[PDB]
Ligand binder design. Structure first.
Ligand code: CLA
Ligand code: CLA
Ligand code: CLA
Ligand code: CLA
Ligand code: CLA
Ligand code: CLA
Ligand code: CLA
Ligand code: CLA
Ligand code: LHG
Ligand code: BCR
Ligand code: SF4
Ligand code: SF4
Ligand code: SF4
Lengths: 743, 80, 97, 138, 136, 38, 155
């Protein structure tokens, strides 16, 4: 039994500006003076690498706890900024009065160089830039009706940021916990499961029951936002809550008497989207938060902490052992308690996967009101969370490789799952590479074959609905099962979880909110393309992590480090052999996969879901059924999607969307500038810099800091950074301009 | 079959031999420096061209130069 | 039978029999739900098998309930088989946890 | 030498020597230890070196030398010998080839591959054109 | 414990896993036209070809460009025969460069030539048999 | 506690100087907009 | 051919088009309310800008074309801004060169380059207001151009 106690060191680090005037103080090599321009880049490259600074785990743990506080403060400042922008420079009240007619906007551009044109006529009196972040819908779902609440929330956010600033400084210069702290994974998990998530969802459920539910009910009943009672009135005067929800007449007595069924007025399970706003029923959302809170709270009492009751993660890990895995998960507990890189890899992979799942679930089941009708917001949110998820996944792979190169130990990883995997890494990577080849052929080859057939006039020999058909029978079957679930497998559910599986369509403000997303041959091919790209990117990352320590080409890659340029022009060439380079390649592949994924979502939504509905139910999509026969060929993807939909971003000049068009061009430049750093080497730039330095010497204007070219690894990093920035910015401007100009 | 050549500017610091991963270099007695030792490459057949020695050489201009010439199984670093 | 190289592997048909009987009995519990029609999934699955066997050439289409019964029955039966072999070899034969 | 020497307790792995090593060169490393240390095999994995004599086979000289480097660094083991075995069966002593580490100056070694003066005196490629001579050749 | 080195000797680039090596796996990999004891190269080639052409005809007849015409089976059979001829050409080239003059043991020029002849004859016969079955 | 030296470092001095330059340019552009051909 | 914009119909047409574009959006708003005043200021600025540009030369497209041949009549178009740019950038270059020359005289010039010496940096920045004159006398004294520098093989 180990005491889960708190031990801290007081005044461990002094608070002074002495170290601010000595850049590179955290590194022994960087504290001796630059001597070259490469030191400037190395200073920032190794600034947040706390593991390279010192060899003590305690110091790294403290440098992480702090700086986590700093990032939390940065997030709180950003949130406060969003709330203040909504309260001061946004048409939030006007939007509340007419959510469908008024375009959300919370940014006002200053009139200086003709940029005042960017202030679009979003309505509501004010003119500004239309925001697609969903801030307006979220605030409405939270019960915000006046800008005073937005101002108070902004002030509270600023205060929380100040608190997260003080906490970060206090936990590094006034009270720094010892390594025994931070190694209590059982206590940290129990608290995060029952306090950070469990109690958090419980509190949010309470807020929704007492604020979101009544305010939104009155809003959806035709009551003006100014005439709705204040949130505190619903708590003080129980008569109002009783009138809006008779369940409140019984009070909390039913909860304590197990007569939970009496809460059918506030805790419903309707299942579908609200026909008035198009979003999920707030009652179902509150009931969902209550259930997730109770489930997380119960889950938070699993591990053992300072008491006999509970579980030991190490015991559970070591208990799992089988014939095909000699030692099972033995030694993994010590791995996740002595290396922050391993924990960061697992957490980054899970956080990225969670973000991707969030994107899918948010578009399919619009949670906020009027979110579905605001297609710009829907496109931006799905695409945004999809991108952040992919970036976090690539980062997860990078940190896994980092741990493998630096924190790995043969004694700890002996005959366990990790060691057993490293033993047969060749089978893993060759079989996975074979899967990638098969997927690419059977996914992209289908598209290429269709291009060849259509060009030859042999349309009868294509992979389409009319010609050879490839129907996702399994996915279509799951959709049908979901369509029939509300009556045979969900007895208490009154409607399908998502109308995208089937049921009927929902229209709000003469606009389609969510209708069944039928899958055909085009969806079959695109889904296989998605799987192919995911397989190749995971192959690149897994290869980099498995061979991070050694390989048949370089027997001691670990000694060379995780981030090294190459072993030289030997053994035929060992360029981009380090794991860091594998992450560098995985970034491009993740970008390609994610770009294709967002492209499919955008086109499919604009051709089969998003659109207008005329009286009597007639439906007219933005691109009427063109995805069925145009998404099956690369030519169609270039003509009906990249060319047809780009007209909005190229013709945006002279209007409020001109900025997007400008960003559309700028991004291209950046994407084309990255090529400079990707198809070139530092030897040539060093020679060019030598000639330029001679020119400077001829005028006695040479700098003391010897100018040097970017390192090989730094050059690769700059190239990938510019490539991703340009590509994501181009598709960002294209998506936003296309969705704002139409729909 | 890469050609490794040692020049007279060698200071006998042994860093090239210490950084060579194929036992291609060694130290032999010499009288051109106070160290009394000079780098030698009597096993160039095992060299792969990684140039770790070139990187580990401290002289102004590398006293050890590796020229990539004939390619064989050893030089290609093929374990298959 | 040898699972790998010269190491023997204990195969017991009783494992399959016990897994099949246990899963059939567990799935034979009636449920007044429209998909199952007031009977266990085992009875419904067997009934669907007979119905589809009558029309041997034509197989079940996407809207046929047979697929749901098949997936659930196989999910549970395979789970009992896998967990059953784990329990028999790991504990009964001494292969260890 | 001593092909019957005991081998470290390893559980296989898929990174060991392939068929090419059977029909071609195959390196071997034989070292002695006093404690059953755990070392990372150059092929990927973890092994326990038998207390006493340890003998293992590899497909590359660099792999054996890297293993020797880690045995000398992670552990204070300096009596590591690397041999080469051909398909015919004749063994060849490769490392250290003289009982002394290469970076340790030792008598009896003849300088090989020496060029007079610095590289700045190398002849131009035009002066040795159409001839079996190189710039580094004096 | 089931995963062991292939030859019980570590440091080998292979592992004796369940499907990799097992009673059932060793029996199945063995006895095949190839790897079976007491089978001449021509017999192995004949069996392999008659087993390959049979399933090779299927794709061409079912999804060939002329799959909808009345000569879909004939066109597919001709396509399969052509593919078989190309494969036989590849086999013969491989035997010509990889193997030298020695005893006929499937690893010599004569052995691989006999194997290629058997493969071609078997593949053509199998394709013809499958075509006959489809027509009937 | 030498804050002056830190404020004198390359990033801080560069950002301050560029901020002042941009501010001067912007202020000149609103007081004297669409300036062309002097 | 080029004609003054004040006498070109294309220029007036463009001015009217811009005014119309602004007025179309201005009509939606109300006289005294947020916005509508924002568009009136833009219209006034458009009028002033076109009246200012009327002196420039433009062809058929009506876009003001700038003559850079060096004609005195068009000095304000390119000559004057060109000279002012050269003065500003020569000032920047000369102050930078002098600061580097001073830093090279310190104990650790690298530290000065990283952590700029605001006192001396400002001392050289404030000066140099006569950089064209300072460039000379440095050249005449031979303190500007160097004699021997770093050169690789095959000079
Ligand atoms: C962390 C989440 C959270 C938080 C902070 C709150 C916070 C609050 N809730 Mg609440 N609530 C939540 C979640 C949450 N809730 C959830 C998940 C549910 C289920 C969906 C409810 C359902 C609920 C109801 C129905 C009510 C509240 C009420 C309240 C407020 C007073 C509670 C109270 O003590 O009254 C105590 C009330 C009692 C009846 C005490 C029970 C025992 C008494 C002593 C019986 C003995 C008889 C006696 C004579 C009293 C007669 C009462 C009878 C006439 C009803 C309070 C600010 C109450 C309120 O103020 O409405 C605005 C209210 O009626 N909540
Ligand atoms: C799926 C059915 C099932 C389940 C859940 C179990 C579970 C268990 N068996 Mg058992 N067994 C089964 C079938 C099953 N058995 C059958 C059919 C046979 C006959 C051959 C046996 C014969 C057998 C023997 C001889 C022994 C066991 C023993 C055990 C226990 C040892 C640990 C273990 O096996 O792992 C599982 C441990 C758990 C705690 C369960 C965790 C489950 C996870 C969290 C979720 C599983 C979801 C699952 C896949 C859902 C499937 C779909 C569903 C519709 C069925 C364990 C609690 C041993 C024992 O008695 O304990 C000492 C032992 O001696 N079993
Ligand atoms: C129920 C108790 C509890 C709660 C609610 C939290 C909550 C949190 N912890 Mg934490 N932790 C706890 C107990 C708890 N912890 C214990 C007992 C240990 C030791 C075993 C740890 C050790 C620990 C570490 C090492 C780290 C965290 C981190 C975090 C943050 C994760 C980042 C995030 O998701 O943003 C969500 C943010 C919010 C929702 C804002 C809420 C913030 C308020 C102030 C609630 C937190 C209360 C705090 C735990 C205790 C107050 C102390 C009091 C003296 C003032 C989050 C705020 C990480 C972090 O970010 O570092 C700062 C991290 O590095 N925790
Ligand atoms: C919670 C997420 C998280 C965290 C905490 C870390 C933490 C860390 N990472 Mg990691 N990483 C992450 C996510 C994360 N990473 C993701 C998502 C990726 C994929 C992109 C990576 C890929 C990655 C690599 C390849 C490496 C690290 C490294 C490191 C370590 C040193 C970082 C450093 O000092 O560089 C300093 C940081 C900078 C100099 C900033 C670079 C700026 C880039 C270009 C982003 C620009 C964004 C911005 C929006 C651009 C537009 C604005 C522009 C116009 C100005 C450190 C412990 C390095 C390491 O382990 O050391 C060996 C390492 O090599 N990370
Ligand atoms: C968009 C693609 C692109 C661009 C813009 C450039 C641009 C350039 N290349 Mg180049 N190149 C490219 C692709 C590109 N290349 C590719 C694919 C290859 C094949 C590998 C090459 C290989 C190559 C070689 C071998 C060489 C060049 C050279 C040059 C420079 C030539 C001199 C010049 O015109 O300077 C003018 C500067 C510009 C055109 C850049 C515009 C100015 C920027 C935007 C201003 C500064 C940033 C600004 C403040 C905004 C950022 C703010 C910040 C907060 C983010 C120039 C900067 C030559 C060179 O070095 O010249 C001396 C050189 O020898 N390139
Ligand atoms: C890689 C994607 C792909 C796929 C799936 C297809 C598929 C097809 N193409 Mg096509 N094609 C492609 C790419 C592709 N093509 C590209 C990129 C081009 C442009 C160069 C073309 C140009 C093209 C033309 C001009 C034509 C076709 C035609 C056809 C059809 C008949 C082709 C045929 O008879 O092949 C023969 C196939 C085989 C001999 C064998 C296939 C492999 C077998 C089935 C794998 C079995 C493995 C097995 C499961 C392993 C385990 C077994 C073991 C354990 C026992 C067919 C549906 C024809 C048509 O009319 O369209 C309908 C036609 O005229 N294609
Ligand atoms: C950095 C260069 C710079 C320069 C050279 C100027 C110069 C000038 N500004 Mg200006 N300003 C700047 C930056 C600058 N500003 C910035 C970054 C902002 C914020 C976006 C402003 C906002 C601003 C406003 C609102 C006004 C001026 C005005 C003026 C003129 C008034 C006369 C004067 O001599 O005051 C010299 C002023 C300065 C040297 C700059 C001081 C700016 C301080 C911080 C005041 C701004 C307070 C702000 C509203 C709230 C807090 C800001 C925060 C940074 C602390 C003037 C010549 C006034 C004007 O239009 O004249 C009729 C006026 O109304 N400025
Ligand atoms: C003391 C500052 C300084 C001075 C006096 C010069 C002067 C000169 N440079 Mg140079 N340069 C500088 C900084 C400076 N440079 C920096 C920081 C860079 C890296 C971006 C370069 C990169 C550079 C290249 C690539 C080339 C020159 C070239 C030249 C020569 C021709 C003009 C030219 O092309 O300029 C070009 C100027 C730039 C590309 C950017 C200048 C950067 C900023 C805006 C100015 C420096 C500000 C400095 C920090 C001020 C210090 C003030 C001090 C009091 C604190 C000329 C003698 C050319 C040459 O080789 O000669 C024929 C040439 O090709 N420079
Ligand atoms: C066969 C029925 C499963 C349907 C296939 C999809 C299952 C999804 C899980 C993925 C892993 C595959 C399951 C076998 C794997 C499995 O569970 O085996 C069983 C075994 C686990 O049993 P142990 O006795 O080792 O248990 C002890 C430890 O697990 C302690 O928890 O796992 C292995 O040791 C081998 C791991 C992968 C072996 C290589 C297979 C790689 C192929 C991956 C592709 C899978 C098929 C793709 C879909 C068509
Ligand atoms: C993957 C898979 C599989 C597969 C299977 C198979 C594939 C089977 C079979 C089979 C086959 C693939 C067969 C074939 C065949 C053929 C035959 C049976 C034939 C024949 C005969 C004849 C009639 C002949 C004739 C001739 C002539 C005419 C002359 C020349 C020579 C010869 C002899 C050729 C399984 C189910 C396992 C599992 C799952 C899936
Ligand atoms: S210099 Fe560049 S190309 Fe050459 S070996 Fe190194 S990383 Fe590879
Ligand atoms: S190139 Fe590499 S292998 Fe060859 S001598 Fe130099 S260090 Fe040794
Ligand atoms: S070649 Fe270089 S590293 Fe080797 S001994 Fe001579 S000077 Fe030292």
């Amino acid at each position: 039994e180990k005491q889960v106690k708190v031990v801290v060191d007081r005044d461990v680090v002094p608070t002074s500006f002495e170290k601010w005037a000595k850049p590179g103080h955290f590194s022994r090599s960087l504290a001796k003076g630059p001597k070259t321009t490469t030191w400037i880049w190395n200073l920032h490259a190794d600034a947040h690498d706390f593991d390279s600074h010192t060899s003590s785990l305690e110091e790294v743990s403290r440098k992480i706890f702090s700086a986590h506080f700093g990032q939390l403060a940065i997030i709180f400042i950003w949130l406060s900024g969003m709330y203040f922008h909504g309260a001061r420079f946004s048409n939030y009240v006007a939007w509340l009065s007419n959510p469908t007619g008024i375009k959300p906007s919370a940014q006002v551009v200053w009139p200086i160089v003709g940029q005042q044109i960017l202030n679009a006529d979003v309505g509501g009196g004010m003119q500004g830039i239309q925001i697609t972040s969903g801030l307006f819908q979220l605030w409405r779902a939270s019960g915000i009706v006046n800008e005073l609440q937005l101002y108070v929330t902004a002030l509270g956010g600023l205060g929380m940021a100040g608190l997260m600033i003080f906490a970060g400084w206090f936990h590094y210069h006034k009270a720094a916990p010892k390594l025994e702290w931070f190694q209590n994974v059982e206590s940290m998990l129990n608290h995060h499961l029952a306090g950070l998530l469990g109690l958090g969802s419980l509190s949010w459920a309470g807020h929704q029951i007492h604020v979101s539910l009544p305010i939104n009910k009155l809003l959806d009943a035709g009551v003006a936002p100014s005439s709705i009672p204040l949130p505190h009135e619903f708590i003080l005067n129980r008569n109002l809550m009783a009138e809006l929800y008779p369940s409140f007449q019984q009070g909390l007595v039913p909860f304590f008497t197990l007569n939970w069924k009496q809460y059918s007025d506030i805790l419903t399970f309707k299942g579908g989207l609200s026909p008035v706003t198009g979003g999920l029923w707030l009652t179902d959302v509150a009931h969902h938060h209550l259930a997730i809170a109770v489930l997380f709270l119960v889950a938070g009492h699993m591990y053992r902490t300072n008491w006999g009751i509970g579980h030991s993660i190490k015991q559970i890990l070591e208990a799992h052992k089988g014939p095909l895995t000699g030692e099972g998960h033995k030694g993994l507990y010590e791995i996740l308690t002595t290396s922050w890189h391993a924990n960061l890899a697992i957490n980054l992979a899970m956080l990225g996967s969670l973000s991707i799942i969030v994107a899918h679930h948010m578009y399919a089941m619009p949670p906020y009101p009027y979110l579905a009708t605001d297609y710009p917001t829907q496109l931006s949110l799905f695409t945004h969370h999809m991108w952040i998820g992919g970036f976090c996944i690539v980062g997860a792979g990078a940190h896994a490789a980092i741990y493998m190169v630096r924190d790995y130990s043969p004694t700890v990883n002996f005959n366990n799952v990790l060691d057993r995997m490293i033993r047969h890494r060749d089978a893993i990577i060759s079989h996975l590479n074979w899967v990638c080849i098969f997927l690419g052929m059977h996914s992209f080859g289908l598209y290429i074959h269709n291009d060849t057939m259509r060009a030859l006039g042999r349309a009868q020999d294509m992979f389409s609905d009319t010609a050879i058909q490839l129907q996702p029978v399994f996915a279509q079957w799951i959709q049908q099962i979901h369509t029939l679930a509300p009556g045979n497998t969900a007895v208490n559910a009154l409607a399908t979880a998502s109308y995208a599986f089937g049921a009927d369509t929902v229209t709000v403000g003469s606009k389609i909110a969510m209708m069944p997303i039928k899958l055909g041959t085009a969806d079959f091919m695109v889904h296989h393309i998605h799987a192919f790209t995911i397989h190749v990117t995971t192959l690149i990352l897994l290869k980099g992590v498995l061979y991070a320590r050694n390989s048949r080409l370089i027997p001691d890659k670990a000694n060379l480090g995780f981030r090294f340029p190459c072993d030289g022009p030997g053994r035929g060439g060992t360029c981009q052999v380090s794991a860091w380079d594998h992450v560098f390649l995985g970034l491009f592949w993740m970008y390609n996969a994610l770009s294709i994924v967002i492209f499919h979502f955008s086109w499919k939504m604009q051709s089969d879901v998003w659109g207008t509905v005329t009286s009597n139910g007639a439906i007219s999509h933005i691109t009427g059924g063109n995805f069925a026969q145009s998404a099956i060929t690369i030519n169609g993807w270039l003509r009906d999607f990249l060319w047809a939909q780009a007209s909005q971003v190229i013709q945006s000049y002279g209007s409020s969307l001109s900025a997007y068009g400008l960003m559309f061009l700028g991004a291209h430049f950046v994407w084309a500038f990255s090529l400079m750093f990707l198809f070139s080497g530092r030897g040539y730039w060093q020679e060019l810099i030598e000639s330029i330095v001679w020119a400077h010497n001829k005028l006695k204007v040479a700098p003391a800091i010897a100018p040097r070219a970017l390192s090989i690894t730094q050059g690769r990093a700059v190239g990938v950074a510019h490539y991703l920035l340009g590509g994501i910015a181009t598709t960002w401007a294209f998506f936003l301009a296309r969705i704002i100009a139409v729909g | 079959a890469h050609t490794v050549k040692i020049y007279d500017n060698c200071i006998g610091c042994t860093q090239c031999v210490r950084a060579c991963p194929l036992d291609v270099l060694e130290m032999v007695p010499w009288d051109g420096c106070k160290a009394g030792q000079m780098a030698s490459a009597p096993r160039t057949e095992d060299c792969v061209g990684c140039k770790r020695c070139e990187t580990a050489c401290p002289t102004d201009f590398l006293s050890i130069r590796v020229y990539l010439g004939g390619e064989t199984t050893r030089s290609m670093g093929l374990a298959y | 039978f040898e699972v790998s190289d010269g190491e023997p592997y204990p195969l017991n048909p009783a494992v399959i029999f016990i897994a099949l009987i246990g899963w059939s009995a567990v799935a034979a519990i009636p449920s007044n739900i429209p998909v199952l029609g007031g009977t266990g999934l085992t009875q419904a699955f067997l009934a669907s098998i007979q119905r589809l066997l009558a029309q041997y050439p034509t197989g079940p289409k996407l809207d046929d309930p047979f697929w749901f019964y098949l997936i659930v029955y196989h999910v549970g039966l395979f789970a009992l088989l896998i967990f059953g072999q784990i329990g028999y070899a790991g504990y009964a034969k001494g292969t260890y946890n | 030498l001593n092909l019957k020497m005991p081998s470290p307790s390893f559980l296989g792995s898929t990174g060991g020597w392939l068929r090419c090593a059977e029909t071609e060169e195959k390196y071997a490393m034989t070292w002695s230890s006093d404690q059953q240390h755990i070392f990372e095999m150059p092929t990927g994995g973890a092994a326990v070196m038998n207390s006493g004599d340890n003998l293992l086979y590899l497909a590359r000289k660099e792999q054996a030398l890297a293993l020797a480097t880690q045995l000398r660094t992670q552990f204070k083991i300096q009596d590591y010998k690397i041999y080469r075995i051909f398909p015919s069966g004749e063994v060849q002593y490769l490392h250290p080839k003289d009982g002394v580490l290469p970076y340790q100056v030792n008598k009896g070694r003849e300088q090989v591959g020496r060029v007079k003066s610095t590289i700045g005196k190398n002849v131009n490629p035009a002066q040795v054109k159409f001839t079996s001579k190189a710039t580094y050749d004096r | 414990d089931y995963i062991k080195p292939y030859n019980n000797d570590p440091f080998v680039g292979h592992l004796a896993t369940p499907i990799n090596s097992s009673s059932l796996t060793r029996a199945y990999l063995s006895q095949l036209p190839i790897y079976r004891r007491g089978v001449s190269p021509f017999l192995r080639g004949l069996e392999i070809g008659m087993a390959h052409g049979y399933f090779l005809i299927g794709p061409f007849v079912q999804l060939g460009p002329l799959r909808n015409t009345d000569i879909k089976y004939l066109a597919g059979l001709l396509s399969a025969i052509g593919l078989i001829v190309i494969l036989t050409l590849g086999m013969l080239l491989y035997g010509a460069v990889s193997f030298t003059n020695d005893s006929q043991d499937l690893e010599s020029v004569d052995g691989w030539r006999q194997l290629a002849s058997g493969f071609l004859l078997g593949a053509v016969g199998g394709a013809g048999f499958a075509y006959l079955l489809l027509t009937l | 506690m030498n804050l002056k030296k830190y404020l004198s470092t390359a990033p801080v001095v560069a950002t301050l100087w560029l901020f002042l330059t941009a501010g001067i340019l912007i202020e000149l552009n609103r007081f004297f907009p669409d300036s062309l051909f002097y | 051919v080029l004609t003054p914009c004040q006498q070109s119909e294309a220029f007036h047409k463009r001015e009217i088009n811009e005014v119309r574009t602004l007025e179309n959006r201005q009509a939606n708003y109300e006289a005294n309310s947020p916005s509508y005043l924002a568009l009136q200021s833009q219209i006034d600025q458009v009028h002033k800008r076109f009246d200012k540009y009327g002196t420039l030369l433009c062809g058929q497209d009506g876009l003001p074309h700038l003559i850079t041949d060096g004609d005195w009549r068009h000095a304000r178009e390119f000559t004057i801004p060109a000279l002012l740019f050269l003065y500003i950038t020569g000032w920047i270059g000369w102050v930078g060169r002098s600061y580097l020359k001073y830093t090279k005289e310190t104990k650790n010039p690298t530290e000065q380059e990283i952590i700029l010496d605001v006192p001396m940096a400002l001392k050289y920045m404030l000066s140099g207001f006569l950089w064209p004159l300072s460039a000379w006398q440095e050249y005449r004294s031979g303190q500007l151009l160097a004699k021997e520098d770093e050169i690789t093989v095959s000079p």
